[PDB]
Structure 1
Amino acid sequence: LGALRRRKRLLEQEKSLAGWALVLAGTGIGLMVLHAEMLWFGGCSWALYLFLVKCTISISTFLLLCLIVAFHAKEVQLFMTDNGLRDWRVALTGRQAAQIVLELVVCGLHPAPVRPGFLGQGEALLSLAMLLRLYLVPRAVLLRSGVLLNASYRSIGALNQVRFRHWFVAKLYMNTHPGRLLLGLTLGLWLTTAWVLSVAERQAVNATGHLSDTLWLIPITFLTIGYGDVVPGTMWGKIVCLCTGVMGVCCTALLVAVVARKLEFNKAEKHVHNFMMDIQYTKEMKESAARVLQEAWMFYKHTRRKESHAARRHQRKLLAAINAFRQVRLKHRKLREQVNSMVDISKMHMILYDLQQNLS
């Protein structure tokens, strides 16, 4: 028991440190976006603010550097707890520490401070290097969701051997809120991606690659339209203008099924609609068959009267009524065949009841 209360304590610590880490990552993104705004719209006479922002981003990513260490050290401590280790060198596995040091390098990425009013070369890509830390988001999605923490879930999942993982929580949030996930994805892409492309290309003299051009360029590449009014010039802009259309194909292809799911009836609604169409078509067959006799006796009346042109007019409408009646009867028979096929699994369970009554 002693390693179990300790386990829950450490897991709560891990959730809290995932919260702080997500907050400090979003803060670093907010620093980089406004730094990129203020360098262009501020000019070269506000360099003191840029200096202080670069020091802020450096301390801001130093904190995330401490936090990832604190996270994965607790994860290792969990793993030692689950197996009763004491030698911490042993549990530090090769692929495990490889992923950890790789994450250290990937979140070691930052626009480091270097120093007639324009940029250097590397410090633009180093500014781009912030949004490569967006992988921490599903980690916080996992830990802030308490389904891993809630014990009854774990009990039933251990009974059915289903292994709660990231793929489980993803399908959980997907099939509990099918609209919200797709909306939060597409609406998160549609503008932010274009801001990133504005970082990727900048012209100094003409100002022909900033926000108001890429914010129109990237939804057009996303929706696979491709006018040609704005075109990326550098190669790094060309890469983003491939990834944009990739994500657009992805969002289109996920949206189409979300549209298609809500269209069909409920299983219960189908019986109701079919039963209503039954009593509609029954009365309609009575209607058409009445039109048959109504025209038939009129043609026979003008036959007994030997009215030539009246019979010539009537018998055409007679045959037309016959043609209508045949199609109505065929629709009724098709729907009745659907009924006898809509009582396939229904009559199966009915004779499952009658099979308990055959066991009785």
Structure 2
Amino acid sequence: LGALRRRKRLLEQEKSLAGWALVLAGTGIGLMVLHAEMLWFGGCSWALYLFLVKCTISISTFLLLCLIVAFHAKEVQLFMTDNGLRDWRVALTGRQAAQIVLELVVCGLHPAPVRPGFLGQGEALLSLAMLLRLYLVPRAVLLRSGVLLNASYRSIGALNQVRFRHWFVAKLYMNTHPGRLLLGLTLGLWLTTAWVLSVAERQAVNATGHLSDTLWLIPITFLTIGYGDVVPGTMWGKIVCLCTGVMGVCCTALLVAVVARKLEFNKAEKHVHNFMMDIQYTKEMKESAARVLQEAWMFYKHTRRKESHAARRHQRKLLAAINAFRQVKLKHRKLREQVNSMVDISKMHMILYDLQQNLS
């Protein structure tokens, strides 16, 4: 029964390694967004500062490599212990080997110290390519949640015959509060996309490399308006703005279902509304009937007495009352017929209950 304890220890170690991976990715992104800004702000005569920054980045990349190796090795360890295990070299899954090699080469590329700012456009491509590290958060977030640890969770879920490998945490998060993290992600992506477009729009003297100017021509997209006050003429700028446009078009279909869901109408409210309609409609029908009968009596009283132009208006009043009565009757029928057959689930529940109570 020691397999349970071994797996629990492996999961705890994996959680610790994922946490360290996330915090060191945070340190790496902190060491980013300063090297590029230092050249464009003030000067670059302080070579010691940039040398120290590059050395710290190299150390951070080395530590990230070490922790990634440890995490994937422990994943292989848990997979090996799950099955009948004899030797370390037994499983060595080929697809997993390709995945780990791809992860290594993704981490392998990194800015390095070589030995009037803005770095031009040629160098620091590897430094700019560090944004690819964003893929780590989806792997860490699901394992960070403690839902996997609950024995009762998987115990109950087993009899349902559903796998809990992936995307069920995403479904549960969407179910808990739709739009909550969606709005935050949509509002937070704008700063990152403006920052990455700034490098593409960087220029020595033209009013396009500034962050403030770059922050404007992306929000003109995702609004489906495109005033076009400025145009990015760079080919990299062209492809990045096309990507922003296509992702904005893709994301434009948001909030449409959840606004209707929030504006829904439960059965209790509909029931009380039908009660209100019933009472109001019977009251209005009684009033209209009284009005039309009183008009008819008025006309009959003035038939034989003072037969003249005065009695003419009463006929038009009678026709108007008749038309109003017809409209009220039509509306009452329209709503009553709809509400009578509106109930389906409750109707069949009542019918089956009556059938069961009938017995023999």
Q: Displacement of 1:167 after TM fit?
A: 1.4
SS in 2 for 1:162: coil
Q: Where do 5+ consecutive residues of structure 1 fail to align?
A: none
Task: Provide, for residues 223-282 of structure 1, a one-character-per-residue CA deviation record: whole Å limited to 9, x for no partner.
Answer: 222111121121111122122122222332122222222112123322222222222222
CA distance in 2, matches of 1:17, 1:123: 33
Deviation at 1:359, TM superposition (A): 4.4
**Unpaired stretches in structure 2, ≥5 consecutive residues:** none
Distance 1:116 1:322, change over 3 A: same
* Corresponding residue number in structure 2 for 1:46: 46
Distance 2:34 2:208 in 1: 20
Change (3 A) 1:342 1:56: same
Give the distance between the partners of 1:359 and 1:145, measured in 2 at CA: 52
* Alpha-carbon distance in 2 for matches of 1:7, 1:233: 55
The structure in which a higher percent of residues are helix is 1
Cα deviation 1:162-214 (Å, max 9, x = unaligned): 11132100010001011312112211212221111112221012242331122
Task: Sort the Cα spacing of 1:308 and 1:149 in 2 relative to 1 into closer, same or farther, 3 A.
Answer: farther
Q: CA deviation at 1:296?
A: 2.5
In the other structure, the counterpart of 1:207 is 207
Distance verdict in 2 for CA 1:359–1:242, change over 3 Å: farther
Using the TM superposition, name which of 204-213 and 42-51 deviates more. 42-51
Distance 2:225 2:277 in 1: 44
1:294 to partner: Cα distance:
3.1
The Cα of 1:358 is off from its aligned counterpart by 3.5
The CA deviation at 1:115 is: 4.6
Partner of 2:251: 251
Q: Deviation of residue 306 (structure 1)?
A: 4.4
2-side partners of 1:286 and 1:34: how far apart?
A: 80
Q: Please report how far the alpha carbon of residue 69 of structure 1 lies from its aligned counterpart in structure 2 after TM superposition.
A: 1.0
Q: Map Cα deviations across residues 128-148 of structure 1 (whole Å, 9 max, x no partner).
A: 211111111111111111111
Residue equivalent to 2:131: 131
Q: Deviations over 1:281-307 (max 9, x none)?
A: 222222322332233323333334345
Instruction: Sort the Cα spacing of 1:294 and 1:19 in 2 relative to 1 into closer, same or farther, 3 A.
Output: farther
Cα deviation code 1:302-328 (max 9, x no counterpart): 334345433332222322222222222
State the superposition RMSD in angstroms.
2.0
**What secondary structure is seen at the aligned counterpart in 2 of 1:295?**
helix
Q: Once structures 1 and 2 are overlaid, which stretch shifts more, 39-48 or 158-167? A: 39-48
Q: How many residues align?
A: 360
Structural mapping, 1:67-78, within 5 Å: 67-78=67-78
Deviates more, 1:222-231 or 1:244-253: 244-253
- How high is the TM-score relative to the length of structure 1? 0.93
TM-score after normalising by structure 2: 0.93
Separation in 2 of the partners of 1:319 and 1:165? 73
Task: Give the whole-Å Cα distance in 1 for the aligned partners of 2:280 and 2:124.
Answer: 71
Q: Which moved more, 1:316-325 or 1:143-152?
A: 316-325
After superposing the two structures, state which structure 1 stretch, 240-249 or 166-175, moved more: 240-249
Partner Cα separation in structure 2 for residue 128 and residue 358 of structure 1: 77
Give the 3 Å change call, closer, same or farther, for CA 194–158 of structure 1 in structure 2: same
* Partners of 1:65 and 1:107 within 8 A in 2: yes
Tell whether the 8 Å contact from 2:118 to 2:202 is kept in structure 1 after alignment: no
**2:328 corresponds to:** 328
The more displaced of 292-301 and 8-17 is 292-301
Structure 1 residues 309, 99: CA separation in 2 closer, same or farther (over 3 Å shift)?
Answer: farther
Matched-pair contact (CA < 8 Å) for 1:58–1:112: yes
Q: Give structure 1 regions of 4+ aligned residues with deviation exceeding 4 angstroms.
A: none
Q: What is the distance in 1 between the residues matched to 2:258 and 2:202?
A: 38
Q: Is the 8 A contact 1:39 1:50 kept in 2?
A: no
Per the alignment, do residues 305 and 87 of structure 1 end up closer, same or farther by CA in structure 2, a change over 3 Å counting? farther
* CA distance 1:302–1:245, change in 2 (3 Å): farther
When residues 51 and 336 of structure 1 are mapped into structure 2, their CA distance, relative to the original with a 3 A threshold, is same
- The question of whether the paired residues in 2 share the 8 Å contact of 1:223 and 1:245 is answered with no
CA change 1:304–1:131 in 2 (3 A) is: farther
Q: Percent identity?
A: 100
Give distance in 2, aligned partners of 1:125 and 1:359. 81
* Equivalent residue number for residue 180 of structure 1: 180
Question: Structure 2: how far apart are the matches of 1:224 and 1:201?
Answer: 22
* Structure 1 pair 313–85 and aligned structure 2 pair: CA distance change class (3 A): same
Cα 1:343–1:222 shift into 2, 3 Å: closer
